[PDB]
Recover the amino acids of this structure.
């Protein structure tokens, strides 16, 4: 009661939000790359410097940002992905909070450069000050968007303390990129670190062979044990791969990539199902190696549980679990 | 790009926020009760109806809310607990986002009734509409604050679906109240369900005996095996109780309450430390029963990681772990 109930300053309120969604450089990358995916992007180039604590440049060939919408794009609670409660209960895109851009820009130097197909001129935008004021200016840029985030946490001393080493932090970026490359085989992704190309995942065309990118990501060992899954029931569909438990090593058990409607996710439920399927098949229980994709009606899953979409809750919980269990158990036989 | 980048409506933006912090009735209770604690409250009465899906009434004898600050209290990003980045990096209260009240009021009928010691008159306030407009009016109320949340999720059909049974949901409230009663022995707390008193934890006076409330909460079995801990090193202090691993049952292992600066918390780090201490002491590894309290300089711990403060990150990670490990290991010998 000594201090008055007061509205938080624009920038500080955003940093608090940034703390719950922007953990480290890998997190900045996840969000910006997911924006590119939503923008219809087909080629995404990521350039990192000093593990991303120095620079994070993400360029995409997505639809781009309108000039008169550059500022809105950097505003809080501003999004083009949903406009009602209905749209929310049926999320069909990675983003929907309209919080990512303003959050990251409040703890770094974020520059947004974009051009839509209907524009001859390209534009650049960024927020500054205690109030996060936006300024828009000319710039040369092809159709699409380039995000440039510099000096992550340069203005949040405390959080900068938690940054690991260049190598470690970049390693996390690499793993996140790896996860996204597996969610969208149809998307070409290039990753560079300190001027050198670390990796490049070329797109897998219509009905093309996925195994190729699969092996390039998870390794050849995994590809040899990988058992393709195709299990469906109405609006529940399980696809992807599961390696034979009898032939899974601790090294392979590192590959436990799971997706819900194309969104990377680590859900205790799904994981429990897949494992039970391997415990009841094989003799003992152990860590399985997999890359499963669960497609489901967006009304049966709630993704508004974590500010970073790290968790989900299935309405019909038991059903979903039994579904994945059978699916996996079906292939192990 | 078809839909324009647009700012979300007041109410919908809050519901999205509510989804990340207000899981179920127990969550509403946690937040409101934590507000009472911050308000200097010494007696907190909680009344629940139909597992809290019908009504959640929390009355406290805290300092209360100023009349001209009732609206601010219900606004977004509005708080009296912090006003700068400095205040944040050194959190000394349960709340600091200024998001709890508006979030819950956007998914229920929340009525705030309060009076400060300097006011003769009491007031009542609540938000309504797509824009969350506040209205303030007369009301009779002693010094303090009463929160009344009705029809949780009445306007969010999807989330209402996830509510368990009356008994289950109330069971979660009971467990949360149990956790808070353990964090503040000096606070009298009364809990009722459907007009009947379920529990009442009376305050433990200055230096009084805690064991009494300890046994009333965790049970007598735990109290018999409980080993008091008192381990300090500078600004790191570990207090509380740990039962002998050799005499811990699966029933007792249900008691694994941990606190950081008086804030209930379940951290994998701390848990790992306590267990390692029991694995290296006893023969095998297993679930330990405990009620530990970790006090530490607010600059060594970051609590701005989860919108509901469900997680933390220690700056000097290894040190903290070794500290709790020794502390526990010290008592087991
Ligand atoms: N690379 C991009 N290309 C085109 N439009 C973009 C790009 N990145 C962002 N946008 C637009 O900017 C708006 C949002 O930025 P952002 O702040 O990330 O929120 P969001 O995507 O709406 N939801 P969330 O991620 O949950 O915060 C989006 O709604 C898009 O319309
Ligand atoms: N029971 C109460 N008694 C007195 N003041 C209260 C009470 N509950 C809330 N308030 C005041 O209302 C303001 C905030 O409500 P709330 O929306 O819960 O945010 P917060 O406590 O600031 N932070 P957070 O919980 O992280 O959102 C507080 O900052 C207090 O000043
Ligand atoms: Mg986004
Ligand atoms: Mg609060
Ligand atoms: Na935005
Ligand atoms: Na508030």
């Amino acid at each position: 009661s000594h201090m008055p109930i007061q509205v938080l300053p624009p920038q500080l309120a955003n940093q608090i939000a940034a703390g719950e969604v922007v953990e480290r450089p890998a997190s900045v990358v996840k969000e910006l790359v997911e924006n590119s995916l939503d923008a219809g992007a087909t080629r995404i180039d990521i350039d990192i410097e000093r593990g991303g604590a120095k620079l994070i440049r993400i360029r995409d060939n997505g639809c781009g940002i309108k000039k008169d919408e550059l500022a809105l794009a950097l505003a809080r609670h501003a999004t083009s992905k949903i406009a009602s409660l209905d749209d929310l209960e049926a999320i069909i895109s990675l983003g929907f909070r309209g919080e990512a851009l303003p959050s990251i820009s409040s703890v770094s130097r974020l520059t947004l450069t974009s051009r839509t197909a209907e524009q001859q001129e390209a534009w650049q935008a960024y927020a500054e000050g205690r109030d996060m004021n936006v300024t828009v200016k000319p710039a040369a840029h092809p159709v699409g968007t380039t995000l440039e985030v510099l000096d992550l946490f340069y203005n949040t001393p405390a959080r900068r303390k938690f940054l690991r080493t260049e190598k470690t932090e970049f390693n996390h970026i690499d793993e996140i990129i790896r996860r996204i490359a597996l969610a969208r085989f149809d998307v070409t992704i290039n990753l560079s670190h300190n001027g050198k190309i670390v990796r490049q995942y070329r797109a897998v065309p219509e009905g093309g062979q996925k195994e190729r990118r699969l092996g390039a990501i998870c390794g050849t060992a995994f590809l040899e044990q990988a058992l393709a899954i195709e299990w469906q029931h109405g609006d529940l569909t399980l696809r992807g791969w599961v390696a034979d438990p009898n032939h899974t090593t601790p090294a392979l058990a590192e590959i436990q990539y799971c997706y819900v409607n194309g969104r990377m996710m680590r859900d205790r439920l799904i994981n429990h199902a897949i494992r039970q399927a391997c415990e009841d098949k094989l003799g003992a229980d152990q860590q399985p190696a997999f890359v499963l994709y669960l497609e489901i009606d967006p009304h049966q899953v709630d993704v508004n549980v974590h500010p970073a979409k790290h968790e989900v809750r299935f309405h019909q919980s038991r059903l979903v679990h039994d579904f994945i269990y059978q699916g996996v158990l079906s292939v192990l036989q």
In short: The pocket of sodium ion (ligand 5) is lined by residues A 73, 75, 78-79, 98, 101-102 (CB under 6 Å).
